[PDB]
Design a protein around this motif. Structure first.
Motif, PDB file in Angstrom:
ATOM      1  N   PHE A 162      35.750  53.776  43.811  1.00 52.25           N
ATOM      2  CA  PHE A 162      35.458  54.678  42.669  1.00 52.25           C
ATOM      3  C   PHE A 162      34.915  53.869  41.508  1.00 52.25           C
ATOM      4  O   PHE A 162      35.341  52.741  41.297  1.00 52.25           O
ATOM      5  N   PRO A 163      34.048  54.449  40.663  1.00 52.34           N
ATOM      6  CA  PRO A 163      33.633  53.818  39.413  1.00 52.34           C
ATOM      7  C   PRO A 163      34.866  53.649  38.536  1.00 52.34           C
ATOM      8  O   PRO A 163      35.732  54.482  38.600  1.00 52.34           O
ATOM      9  N   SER A 164      34.944  52.517  37.840  1.00 47.43           N
ATOM     10  CA  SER A 164      36.216  52.018  37.276  1.00 47.43           C
ATOM     11  C   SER A 164      36.236  52.260  35.760  1.00 47.43           C
ATOM     12  O   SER A 164      37.268  51.963  35.165  1.00 47.43           O
ATOM     13  N   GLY A 165      35.134  52.706  35.166  1.00 46.50           N
ATOM     14  CA  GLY A 165      34.980  52.823  33.695  1.00 46.50           C
ATOM     15  C   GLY A 165      36.121  53.584  33.028  1.00 46.50           C
ATOM     16  O   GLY A 165      36.660  53.078  32.029  1.00 46.50           O
TER      17      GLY A 165
END
Ligand SMILES: *[C@@](O)(C(=O)NCc1ccccn1)[C@H](Cc1ccccc1)NC(=O)[C@H]1CCC(=O)N1Cc1ccccc1
Ligand SMILES: *[C@@](O)(C(=O)NCc1ccccn1)[C@H](Cc1ccccc1)NC(=O)[C@H]1CCC(=O)N1Cc1ccccc1
Lengths: 305, 305
Positions: free
Chosen positions: B8-11
């Motif tokens: 998953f994108p971690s932002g």
């Protein structure tokens, strides 16, 4: 302890991803300061892609033909120019989330994180190597064009890849952020041959050092060998030749594990000739080449961002 | 096309990570609204860890014994309570970057992304599975305690894992965000036995569907089999038994590829008994069990966040 295919945290890149529409073509763009970067084929219909004339297609287009969305925020295009295979759209608004960045052209064997996107929205992050034949073995669907690859050094984002095409063999091709293709590829839908792929020897050696660091030592053998003798063997198995530059780069790993590079070379030599015998190294039954010496140091020493 | 271990994108998680210091113990915390969550052993010295009395150690501590830094910014602790193996530190400031979130306890076989942190600072992101014996095969160094695992469900972050310790055998143990351990583990430095691990059969079947979707079809055989017959074989090779629930969960992949679950089961049966014979599936020489049926659908259909 342990060893994973680890990607960079993607947060600084997530706030740069936008949606670019021209006519009926939608794909991903990168918004840094007041410029949006995207693949130039955004101006193509699916028909045009067989034999595109980028000149004549671009002349038929004005600033307001280009819809740029960052979320639900409309950006206004006040300028457009084509730089090789990339379009630069000048927009009215500087991206307030622009990180410290730079554009780098990477070499074959170097690794980077890909933020895979659809309609300007992040879907997933994974770590890749640029293959020696200048392809990447990615995971991309329709609409992923304009997705980017990056490295982070401290607070700085290094953009090295923009995704353009899937080749008929299901591997991936793209440009640096100046729009120059990696490899002999063109942005046209026509049969294109990638050359033979080769194993990135220096990366396999980095991964063997990683194995030793993590307690996997069974492959360590009695023998040594010379570069010249090692390379004769490597070329038979489609491994890249090893240079003095590679040996210099492996110095820190050599010094940490107390194993001289040439000793690790002899160990690899036996594995090529005799294979792994249905044993595993770091949970894999193949020799991995998508970790650089820097990746191994980063992961086994705990470097942050 | 292609298939990768995608995180998953971690932002949304990166803006929640803080540094927590108590005396000279420093580790990672999660800042959501006006509460910081961290492993309770932050109040331990290295010495205390052998046989800690957490009640007694926590009574000696006041609010100002706890240093919380988000980057350059010191946060003020105005409240502290212990919930099982987690400490909840109430701070004067709500995190402006608090995402929509939930706390979930996941089941063995489920996957999640880990944001590996040191000193409150993100170092990398990778995907893994909760093993059937409730360990994870992570990549963690000293100072990684308080790193979290998460899933993203559209705009909502589901936190399911907080990292606490490495077992003597090099695998990883932690809690849900309510501080209940996964598995029989305690936050004490003492030899602890993880159960026998098993292969997550339903995930291996999901990955074979992913292979077929991507053009790897050589393993597809003439034969069929029954659940009961399939399961007798699986139990010999340390595979989890397959239930009607698993068959129901594979229905959409079955329908997409035109291959009945039990047909795919017969194909897996042969690979257990005869192995892979040099050949690879999706670039691996072993059967992968860290993709769920949902992971495969997400990656092969292009779901965004
Ligand atoms: C694109 O440049 C892109 O996504 N390429 C990378 C890619 C493609 C497939 C697999 C992996 N990686 C274009 C841009 C575009 C978008 C919408 C309409 C026209 C052009 N996107 C595509 O998906 C292109 C390239 C492959 C393809 O079939 N295609 C046109 C298309 C798009 C959607 C549905 C059917 C056909
Ligand atoms: C923290 O619990 C942690 O990092 N655990 C997870 C983990 C994963 C892989 C490898 C090691 N650890 C503790 C907390 C801590 C930090 C600093 C000082 C005291 C306690 N961090 C550790 O590194 C623990 C576990 C191994 C270790 O050496 N250690 C205690 C320690 C650290 C330094 C000097 C003496 C003792």
């Amino acid at each position: 302890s342990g060893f994973r295919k680890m990607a960079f945290p993607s947060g600084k890149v997530e706030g740069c991803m936008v949606q670019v529409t021209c006519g009926t073509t939608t794909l991903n763009g990168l918004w840094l300061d007041d410029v949006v970067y995207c693949p130039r084929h955004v101006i193509c219909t699916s028909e045009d892609m067989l034999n595109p004339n980028y000149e004549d297609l671009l002349i038929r287009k004005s600033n307001h033909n280009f819809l740029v969305q960052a979320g639900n925020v409309q950006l206004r295009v006040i300028g457009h120019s084509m730089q090789n295979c990339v379009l630069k759209l000048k927009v009215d608004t500087a991206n307030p989330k622009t990180p410290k960045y730079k554009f780098v052209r990477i070499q074959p064997g170097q690794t980077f994180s890909v933020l895979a996107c659809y309609n300007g929205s992040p879907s997933g992050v994974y770590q890749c190597a640029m293959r020696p034949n200048f392809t990447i073995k990615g995971s991309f669907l329709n609409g992923s064009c304009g997705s980017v690859g990056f490295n982070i050094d401290y607070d700085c984002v290094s953009f090295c890849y923009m995704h353009h095409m899937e080749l008929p063999t299901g591997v991936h091709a793209g440009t640096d952020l100046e729009g120059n293709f990696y490899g002999p590829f063109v942005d046209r839908q026509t049969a294109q041959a990638a050359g033979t792929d080769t194993t990135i020897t220096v990366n396999v050696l980095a991964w063997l050092y990683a194995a030793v660091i993590n307690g996997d030592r069974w492959f360590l053998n009695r023998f040594t060998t010379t570069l010249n003798d090692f390379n004769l063997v490597a070329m038979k198995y489609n491994y890249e030749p090893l240079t003095q530059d590679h040996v210099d780069i492996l110095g820190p790993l050599s010094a940490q594990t107390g194993i001289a590079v040439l000793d690790m070379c002899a160990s690899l030599k036996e594995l090529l000739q005799n294979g792994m015998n249905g044993r595993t190294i770091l949970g894999s039954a193949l020799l991995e080449d998508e970790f650089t010496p820097f990746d191994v140091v980063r992961q086994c020493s705990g470097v942050t961002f």
